[PDB]
């Protein structure tokens, strides 16, 4: 199938994941950022470009201002998005996006103008023969290898759930939540100031993100952990900064991820992640709820904290009735489960009849996308 | 007689009963329902059919809308009936309906178009060599082993009686009644709302039907039972739903089956089951009434409530004169007595001359059925 | 009759309506909500209470979480209900509920524990000399001035019908439906997200409710309206939210009220409002159906959409036979017809003998209500 | 004669006929029914009575249960009969039954207790100065204007014949028959079910009675009519029910009245109407039979079917010898011939000496009636 070799490209709120259908791991993973210089140059003939995309911006991050083209899964800057797509197709995968149909992903309940503009850029700036837009949670269930269960996806901008029974989706039970990794990073920056550490710039935000994902964990019991931390001092680890200085973090290690289960720490009116998952189940039919309780799939980077699965099981068992058995299925490769399911779907023989052709778009205007792709 | 092996197939308002002549129990019993999907599928290549018949629909009943092809013993949907017959003949009995003559049953006082269409489907869609239509109450008396007595049959849609003296039927004394299991199920659903339990969907109707047939009974004295139930609390049982919740039922246990003897609870103008049985006897000749009083046969699923026979004896003795002796004959296998009598009749040597041939139908149009079969 | 001056107090799923018998309009109408603070106070001596009831909660709705004490006509919080009753009797009507008998209303087919607890609170917390519970649909027919016809009532939680012939009720024909204003509000919130507007909090729900009741209408023909809306742009209106921002609504103006006639939009198994009204008529006797077809009374807030009466007439004429004449009677004051009928009934001279006395709930108890009041 | 103004009141099994002697037509004709409410009233002060008599019951027949006080010419309910007599004397004729002697009618071969109780009610509850009981068939011959011939009377409960020669009655030749309009109505209801129309309630019985008397007729040759009806479709008429529906009747138009000549359709052992009339003639003397063959008088409502006279002539000619001439005398006003003859008899000058006085009853107990009035 080289001819098609569907270039499976995912663009998560925080990262970009591209590759080829049939493989078991993404070829390219890099941050979705665009940087621009903020000082005046004195060296002449240095070959200073006007923009840097991806890992190059993270390297020389001390002299640029970094901007995220995507906020909360909604595009706000379209010039920056075109720059990122050009980087992925030419300088990273080094392929020609004119003979490979492309499969894209999108969160549920997005504005319709998003998919209209996605199709227009792909068919006009590039000449891709076909395209299809799929819900990211459905692709996660493909990777899990099962056709029954409620899926949780939490990336960098959005958190959504969708339960589907024997291949049948219940669109009235889909719930969305605007709590993800970026809110946790801002909260950790705010609460690190009690010990005297002040991080304000965008470059300092990247430093704080690294600290969070290497030293934080979810506590099984929140109140009891505080008493142990207050009494002794064994719950302390040291981190060295990019310039060589040392910081020590105590109860902030588990106080930051706790915001997922108690959103009132940030002052937003919303339910916790455990209650949202339970609320989606209770919106389904009576006769299918038992199979949903025993098939729960976790996905996304924000679900990779240590000890999250045990805490989730404890909370849901307290909510659900005693007789039912609750099982949380968190495979070790759940960080890339969305991409894995996309490759499997594009390699199916029966899927080849649902591509959107170039001819159909030319005759009927850029709306076919809303009715098509289900 | 394998050659004939009459495929004895009964199609009661609620259930379907098929098998072979000469056996003592039906081979296949399953609900007479057809289900169709009501959501939109997202999983591809799942092998999702467009219709489910029988036990398959009851399994996955949480995503379909269930329809009954038969209401009150009168056919309303003919495509669904053809689907059910195809299921029984091929996927359940796994026989070829081309060399076995078929015996069907029908309630008295039905529209004539019913038997005309039954014959046309059997002779055109299938190629059955012969067929015969028998009254279900007559077959019940065959199973009882006697040729004198008044038979009561109450299934899911209709209730009828027919008294026959020494092999002679009195067609002027046949009485019909539109009160059966479905009316009781609707009444129980309506009266369960006083305690806060709300069942509305068709799937919830199946749940309510199971509750009714496992926890309900007929009270010997209606007024006295209410005083005992009001005073104490020993008349209470617990039931667990399909999803782990628990309901408690008090006086609703015996208030639901009571509607058979007092039809005014549903607001319909009609007599009770005891008065209907007595009314049929008084329409017969004087000299045969004494043998009818001492030979009463009960049949059908709705007559399977505990304590129904004792209550029936008490009511009829109060109506009939003191000198006569009233005996109610309710064998333990009366749930299948209609099917049992059909097998016995089809295995009789003297019955083989009354089959309707294929040749007679072809020459004389589909009306022979009305004059034939008595 | 000042002495009695029956305090006519109605408590609809969404609003509360109180006043005095003999008047032509309710004195007090205000939302049935209770609010509680959700932030921590820093100003000292501000006189900050712990709860707000009614219009005070709607004023300062930006810092509280609002809860509805009534869901689907069934009480769930009893402390909040006592708070609301205290507000109405003292701070709004400014009367003493000890010398005026009180008339309350209730939807049919409610749990019996509801009226038991209503009587206990009124006779113990307050010392009201007498009380009576009436069906809201019967009171609506009193206001219409006629004693023949089928009444439709649709408020905020329930929709019910009850046909009554010459003062005789047919309790076997009463039908209930759980589709009202709250389901429409949730659906409009869900379907407003396609244009990018996201309302999630409870305060944002009140904003969405105002938009719905000032810019929505029922289309005479659903399919044809979509073609006109797709082609031109004249079907668009602007609304200005509380911070100065403006939103534009297109086909969502008539897509929201359409859910009443096609309940499958919300994914619930039920019939439309037109089919429910027709189904109730066909459950009545043959000889009284002709007078019911020409006497149809609409009531409740949800029936106040523009163009609802014309659409209802078209649907029922297509269902009913051609010879009958269908007339829909929708008076301009049908928003308060339930309250109007209650005042008329309490002012009748022949009604004074059916009050429930105080000595009877001390010689009988709070169950007298089930047998009494019909 | 105003003073006497004999209030000629007839009470046929089905209808009541009252008026004044000397007139040529009854003043009041209305059904002999009593209705009672069967539902519970909610409207207060509606002036709902506990019983309705006559045309008022037929108007509001959709909410009552109707009972006939008379079955087969024998009184069974005496409270209902007193109610009907009170209605006729006060609310319809508006006269005082204390100064007008009353003439009543009765079928032959009734129980003696009937006339004993009739006299007691009239002399005690009312104070009528005089009474007389006459055979209805004798009064029919008075209206015909002849004193020779055999009279046939068929009303709603009984059919009787009595031949009288030159003013001399032959009481040994009187024959009675229990086949009248009510049996025909029940048979039509039973045989209408073959086309799918189900009428069961008492109100539905009145609908069926109207259909029978407006679309039924007697066929001259029964077998030949069936062949014509089977072949073509011109023998079909349409009728519109009260709620808008439309029913079509084919061979049931003449199959219902045929039961008069072939009583075996209802399964009763009896002779046909033609054979009963012939049997009465053959029980008379030889020398008076010739004048009886040429003087046959028909009377009653059941004899009003079209084509009955021609069929009767054909059957009797086949039975009687060829030389005799058979003439059937059916005047156009034979529906009221019994009442007409009663007025003529009460206006005769020579009849005034045969009244039963009030004084004779007081001295000699209520038996004088059996020996008196012949
Ligand atoms: N080891 C880890 N521990 C905790 N959080 C992590 C870890 N690795 C990644 N994350 C979180 O996952 C997020 C990245 O999600 P990503 O896979 O980019 O989602 P998407 O591709 O949909 O944008 C980061 O914001 C980071 O906070
Ligand atoms: N154990 C039981 N207790 C009470 N009711 C029962 C029981 N078993 C069956 N029934 C009733 O009998 C009905 C089934 O009747 P069925 O035998 O199908 O009649 P038919 O074959 O004529 O349709 C069901 O509707 C059910 O309500
Ligand atoms: N002008 C309007 N247009 C559309 N909907 C309205 C309008 N006015 C009121 N409503 C709806 O009617 C409902 C109020 O019903 P209400 O009269 O309180 O019933 P009840 O008294 O039984 O609670 C509100 O939820 C609102 O959505
Ligand atoms: N036009 C008609 N065709 C057929 N039957 C009729 C017609 N008119 C009246 N009848 C029958 O005659 C009966 C009325 O008989 P009626 O004169 O009341 O006898 P009586 O006065 O002795 O009760 C009704 O039951 C009805 O069935
Ligand atoms: Mg993700
Ligand atoms: Mg049965
Ligand atoms: Mg209302
Ligand atoms: Mg008569």
Author numbering:
A (entry chain A), B (entry chain C), C (entry chain B), D (entry chain D): 1 to 374
From the paper:
To determine the structural characteristics and differences between actin isoforms, we solved the high-resolution structures of single-isotype skeletal muscle α-actin (3.37 Å), cardiac muscle α-actin (3.07 Å), ß-actin (2.99 Å), and γ-actin (3.38 Å) in the filamentous state using cryo-EM. Our 2.99–3.38 Å resolution structures of filamentous actin isoforms show that the N-termini of bare muscle and nonmuscle actins have different orientations that contribute to distinct binding interfaces for myosin motors and likely other ABPs.
Specifically, we used our previously established Pick-ya actin method to recombinantly produce human ß-actin and γ-actin in an engineered Pichia pastoris strain that expresses the human N-acetyl transferase NAA80 and histidine methyl transferase SETD3 to ensure uniform Nt-acetylation and methylation of H72/H73, a conserved PTM profile of vertebrate actins. The structures show local resolutions ranging from 2.1 to 3.5 Å for skeletal muscle α-actin, 1.9–3.3 Å for cardiac muscle α-actin, 1.5–3.0 Å for ß-actin, and 2.1–4.4 Å for γ-actin. For ß-actin and γ-actin, we could resolve the entire N-terminus starting from amino acids D1 and E1, respectively. Specifically, the presence of resolvable density allowed us to model the entire N-terminus including the Nt-acetylated D1 (D1Ac) and the Nt-acetylated E1 (E1Ac) in the cryo-EM reconstructions of β- and γ-actin. The acetylation site on the N-terminus is exposed on the filament surface and adds an additional negative charge to the already negatively charged N-terminus. The presence of both key PTMs in our cryo-EM reconstructions emphasizes that our recombinant human actins represent bona fide post-translationally processed, mature nonmuscle actins. Furthermore, we observed a cluster of positively charged amino acids (R661, R663, and R664) in loop-2 of NM2C that may interact with either the acetylated N-terminus of ß-actin (D1Ac, D2, and D3) or the acetylated N-terminus of γ-actin (E1Ac, E2, and E3) to stabilize the interface.
